[PDB]
Amino acid sequence: GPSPPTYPGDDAPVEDLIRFYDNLQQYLNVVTRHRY
Amino acid sequence: GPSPPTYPGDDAPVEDLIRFYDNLQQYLNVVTRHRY
């Protein structure tokens, strides 16, 4: 199962945003596997 | 200025997650321009 990406906010440090990016990228790699 | 990506949640429909992905991708394209 894909992990739920934790979102601290948009005011959060960009490294946290990057971490979310990677987690969401993996999340979509799982969910939207060759879809959308 | 980069737009603050709205996060409805991880239980939200994946199309909303994809939208966040694009907005966050653009956000990082602005912020982390050839950085991190």
UniProtKB/Swiss-Prot annotation, chains A, B:
Please verify whether the record's keywords include Acyltransferase.
no
> Where on the chain is Tyrosine amide found, per UniProt?
36
Q: Give one Pfam family.
A: Hormone_3
Q: Which GO terms describe its biological process?
A: feeding behavior; neuropeptide signaling pathway
Query: The organism sits in which domain of life?
Result: Eukaryota
Q: Which InterPro entries match?
A: Pancreatic_hormone-like (IPR001955), Pancreatic_hormone-like_CS (IPR020392)
Keywords for this protein? Amidation, Cleavage on pair of basic residues, Hormone, Secreted
Tell me where in or outside the cell this protein is found: Secreted
Supply one GO CC term from the record.
Answer: extracellular space
Q: Which GO terms describe its molecular function?
A: neuropeptide hormone activity; neuropeptide Y receptor binding
The protein's role, per its UniProt record:
Hormone secreted by pancreatic cells that acts as a regulator of pancreatic and gastrointestinal functions.
Family membership noted in the UniProt record: Belongs to the NPY family.
Q: What is this protein called?
A: Pancreatic polypeptide
Which organism is this protein's natural source? Meleagris gallopavo (Wild turkey)
Upper lineage is: Eukaryota, Metazoa, Chordata, Craniata, Vertebrata
